């Protein structure tokens, strides 16, 4: 271990107050930080342990400190025989130890971590907070720093060199150690963790280790001491499933008359609230008998149970849910007065977390592997849901009709278990908004409270492909003209595909829904396919990522990413994907057509070893079928022939051990006839040579302009204008797009030396 670098601050002050860097050879001074140097590693580990005792911090953060940093330090101190290192905690006579742990759920998957013991102090690895809350494409520090802010063997010779190289290494390490602080204070992590621990009543270490059961157990016990009840222990392996939610059958297609969306807000917690459903008021089938009082003492549910009215008991789950609902309402009332966009979405994150907590209260009941299940309640909930949504659809389509004085009889096109997308008939967004608000407020008056239906949007135009797949354009007000698109479910929000395909789907829906020009859309898709086949598409747009889950399900059937991961490298059998992460790969061309798991390769390996790409795989398996989903419903099946013919005019333009034994046959630039001698033009195509020189110097001119815009961008992203660039960042498009233009220019410069020189040079 050669350098340790530390940043420290008091919470509430907008800058740090401590900035220290401890190195292992003599170094050069850095303005703003202290620098100390040692000639042996024992002094370095001792100095860090003494600093961490004396400063005595409350919280320790970092990025991947649990699974890399602390056990490396502990094992390295054990090897070098330094006895006083592993006492990092607060208790004076206690040493620390490495211990494995695993967590698994159907919500976050399964992850295996080490833990290191520190008594008194709290740990917050920001990697685990990101991996638990956020669903992203890559989880590298560079990728999340670009997504939120906007950015090994070389180091061994920056350290065996001079002291300005070591000073450069220390400035790099200090920037690395500074980035997670900025992420912690910018994303409102710690304020939301403190508010979660105050609303639920669990400690601050449980929100990084546990799930959503300890919190609902805690709140139920805290509500149970106030009336004098005790909880039982029921455990069963195992019950059966029950029936979930209804989806209404669509009227599929393309709509160009406005559809208004009406939905219920906080549906399942308000069902559980306003019909008095709880553990503590579930009536067994016999204890009603032989009392006969049915009216206003109990009710009956569509699955079949009987539940006591609120004039006898009050349940415990209504009160816990009412507290959580008021907390989320206060968070939304605070969110309704922000102007900054990233701040608006992080308050949206806070309210999303409180709504997830309130819904996991209901999901506690149906978990037959758990601590206290009561599937009768769950069945009553979803039965009430189904009954109310079909009530909504009957009522909306039945009242506003041609005989009832209105304009047109409306017709529901879609509904998915909480929402209803009714198509009204008018093509004026003001009149649709007015009637939709009247409908929402009208239908809501047929229920107990807090059951309320609300207007939410007007889509104009609309595109419905299947169940859980649609798109549209979003209206919030009228003079607020339009907000954005909505892409529910489609190929632009999933992460199982290429960036090329998601970009093409977004650009096609842009040209098709905003400008309403299908001809520019056809020309766009043609240019994408043509530039694919002509081999001028970057390999950033070709990378596919998949998650490496539990190893036995991936034992059960052969996949591509599992095959790439389990195949080690010759260079490194010590850095490879583990369980739970994401494996990136691209597909190269070969002749083993039975298996697409035999053609997958690491992006850096195909970078350094230059393997070709299977353009037919990407053409017929990645691109073609999402396009045939989207482009068909506006036209007939002559549209499938239109895009497969727009392919056909553009499919006829394709660019191209033994490879060393070349002959390098020259070819005519005009008509492609191989011939003896080095002159560029053919003897039949000579009278046309000024035009053939004119052609292709406007190509060299455009490659020259692309070299310079890229190789000076690295100088501004690096910081310095006087020293070399070293950044092989695999998540930057800049890298390997700066590598191919050198070769394009190398090739296009040599093609023009077929022609003579435009003058002498030795004069």
């Amino acid at each position: 271990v050669i350098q340790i670098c530390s940043l420290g601050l008091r919470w509430g002050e907008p800058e740090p107050f401590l900035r220290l860097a401890l190195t292992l050879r003599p170094c050069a001074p850095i303005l703003g930080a202290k620098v100390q140097s040692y000639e042996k590693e024992e002094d370095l580990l001792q100095a860090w342990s003494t600093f961490i005792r004396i400063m005595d911090p409350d919280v320790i953060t970092g990025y991947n400190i649990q699974n890399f940093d602390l056990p490396y330090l502990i094992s390295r101190a054990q090897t070098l025989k330094v006895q006083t290192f592993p006492f990092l905690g607060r208790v004076a006579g206690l040493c620390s130890n490495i211990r494995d742990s695993s967590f698994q759920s159907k919500q976050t998957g399964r992850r295996d971590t080490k833990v290191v013991s520190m008594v008194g102090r709290v740990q917050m690895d920001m990697l685990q907070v990101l991996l638990r809350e956020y669903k992203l494409r890559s989880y590298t520090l560079n990728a999340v720093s670009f997504h939120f802010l906007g950015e090994h063997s070389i180091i061994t010779d920056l350290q065996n060199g001079n002291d300005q190289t070591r000073r450069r290494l220390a400035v790099y390490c200090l920037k690395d150690a500074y980035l997670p602080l900025r992420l912690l204070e910018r994303l409102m992590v710690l304020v939301n963790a403190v508010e979660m621990a105050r609303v639920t009543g669990v400690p601050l270490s449980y929100l990084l280790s546990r799930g959503q059961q300890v919190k609902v157990v805690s709140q139920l016990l805290r509500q149970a001491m106030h009336e004098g009840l005790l909880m039982p222990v029921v455990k069963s392996e195992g019950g059966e499933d029950y029936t979930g939610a209804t989806v209404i059958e669509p009227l599929k297609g393309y709509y160009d008359v406005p559809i208004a969306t009406l939905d219920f807000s906080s549906l399942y917690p308000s069902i559980m609230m306003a019909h008095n459903l709880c553990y503590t008021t579930l009536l067994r089938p016999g204890t009603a008998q032989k009392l006969g009082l049915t009216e206003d003492q109990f009710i009956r549910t569509p699955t079949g149970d009987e539940f006591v009215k609120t004039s006898v008991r009050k349940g415990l789950l209504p009160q816990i849910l009412e507290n959580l609902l008021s907390a989320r309402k206060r968070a939304k009332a605070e969110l309704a007065k922000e102007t900054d966009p990233l701040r608006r979405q992080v308050l949206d994150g806070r309210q999303l977390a409180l709504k997830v907590s309130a819904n996991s209260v209901y999901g506690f009941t149906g978990a037959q592997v758990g601590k206290l299940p009561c599937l009768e309640i769950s069945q009553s909930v979803t039965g009430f849901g189904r009954q109310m949504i079909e009530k909504t659809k009957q009522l909306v389509e039945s009242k506003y009709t041609v005989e009832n004085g209105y304009s047109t009889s409306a017709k529901v096109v879609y509904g998915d278990t909480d929402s209803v997308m009714c198509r009204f008939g008018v093509s004026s967004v003001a009149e649709a908004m007015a009637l939709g608000r009247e409908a929402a407020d009208w239908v809501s008056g047929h229920f107990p409270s807090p059951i309320r239906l609300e207007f939410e949007k007007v889509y104009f135009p609309y595109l419905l492909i299947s169940k859980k797949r649609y798109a549209g354009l979003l209206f919030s007000s009228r003079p607020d003209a339009h907000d954005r698109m909505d892409c529910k479910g489609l190929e632009a929000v999933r992460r199982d595909n290429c960036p090329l395909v998601a970009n093409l789907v977004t650009a096609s829906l842009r040209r098709l829904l905003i400008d309403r020009d299908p001809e520019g859309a056809v020309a766009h898709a043609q240019d994408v396919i043509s530039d694919l086949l002509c081999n001028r598409i970057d390999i950033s747009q070709l990378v596919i990522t998949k998650e490496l889950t539990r190893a036995a399900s991936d034992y059960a059937g052969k996949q591509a990413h599992v095959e790439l991961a389990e195949r080690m490298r010759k260079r490194d059998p010590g850095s490879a994907p583990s369980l739970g992460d994401r494996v990136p790969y691209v597909i190269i061309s070969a002749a083993k057509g039975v298996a697409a798991y035999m053609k997958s390769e690491d992006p850096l390996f195909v970078l350094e070893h230059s393997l070709p790409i299977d353009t037919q795989y990407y053409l017929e398996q990645q691109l073609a079928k999402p396009l045939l989903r989207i482009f068909e419903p506006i036209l007939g099946e002559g549209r499938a022939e239109a895009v497969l013919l727009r392919g056909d005019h553009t499919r006829c333009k394709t660019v191209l051990g033994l490879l060393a034994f070349a002959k390098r046959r020259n070819c005519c630039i005009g008509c492609r006839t191989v011939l003896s001698h080095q002159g560029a033009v053919c003897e039949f195509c000579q009278p046309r040579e000024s035009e053939l020189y004119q052609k292709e110097v406007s190509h060299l001119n455009a490659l020259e302009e692309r070299f310079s815009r890229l190789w000076t961008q690295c100088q501004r992203c690096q910081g310095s204008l006087h020293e070399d660039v070293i950044c092989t960042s695999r998540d930057c498009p800049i890298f390997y797009m700066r590598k191919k233009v050198r070769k394009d220019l190398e090739d296009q410069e040599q093609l023009l030396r077929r022609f003579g020189p435009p003058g002498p040079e030795a004069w």
Partner: protein, 249 residues
């Protein structure tokens, strides 16, 4: 304007059945000398060299040296619409991006097919004219069988050529085996060993090369230390078809 008349059209059929599975898109260099084609395979592990001399054709004619990137799969499909006895006629227009295939039945029927050409910027390679330590001539059928047999034992074949004879061998899950040929008209095996050689090749590709068996009674194998194996089938008076396979290192 190109125009070639080939009476034994079955030759053209056999040729495409020998390239189609190895090559998707190729380029044919037509000229007064005859038709020619050279292309790496998909895998970029081998190189095919086709040579159809104008002499072999019963009527050749090439005004402009015109080459069109042909889709061997489409040309293959098209060529299957020809009887093994029809007279085939290739005919192109220096200005048209389409090649024409006309089949004349011996006896009242004429098929005409216009195949769409395409712009191919194929990666050209140059073969380094070299000498070979060993050249083995043998029935093409025997060679074909050998490659099929071994393919059941393992994925690669070690071709060991010594003074007396040549040996092919492989190994896998179900053990291993080897076939030995020794010197002894188109049923005989001749060997020219200047230097014993030993090289490893993928049976998968050798098996592709063998789709050319119906083109010749015999096939010659030319090897040499650390260089591509040469598998060649003569196309009687027309020219030939050569397959170069990079060895495994």
């Amino acid at each position: 304007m190109f125009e070639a008349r080939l009476v034994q059209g079955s030759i053209l059929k056999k040729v495409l059945e020998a390239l189609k599975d190895l090559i998707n898109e190729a380029c044919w260099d037509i000229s007064s000398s005859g038709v020619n084609l050279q292309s790496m395979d998909s895998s970029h592990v081998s190189l095919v060299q086709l040579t159809l001399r104008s002499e072999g054709f019963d009527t050749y004619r090439c005004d402009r040296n015109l080459a069109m990137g042909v889709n061997l799969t489409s040309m293959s499909k098209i060529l299957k619409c020809a009887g093994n006895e029809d007279i085939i006629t290739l005919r192109a227009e220096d200005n048209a991006d389409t090649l024409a295939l006309v089949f004349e039945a011996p006896n009242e029927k004429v098929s005409d097919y216009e195949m769409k050409l395409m712009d191919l910027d194929v990666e050209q390679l140059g073969i380094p004219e070299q000498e070979y330590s060993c050249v083995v001539k043998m029935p093409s059928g025997e060679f074909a069988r050998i490659c099929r047999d071994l393919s059941h034992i393992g994925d690669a074949v070690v071709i060991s050529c010594a003074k007396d004879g040549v040996k092919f061998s492989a190994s896998g899950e179900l053990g291993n085996g080897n076939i030995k040929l020794s010197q002894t008209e188109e049923e005989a095996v001749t060997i020219e060993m200047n230097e014993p050689v030993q090289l490893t090749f993928a049976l998968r590709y050798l098996n592709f090369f063998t789709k050319a068996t119906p083109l010749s009674s015999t096939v010659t194998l030319s090897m040499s230390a650390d260089v591509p194996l040469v598998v060649e089938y003569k196309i009687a008076d027309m020219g030939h078809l050569k397959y170069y396979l990079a060895p495994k290192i």
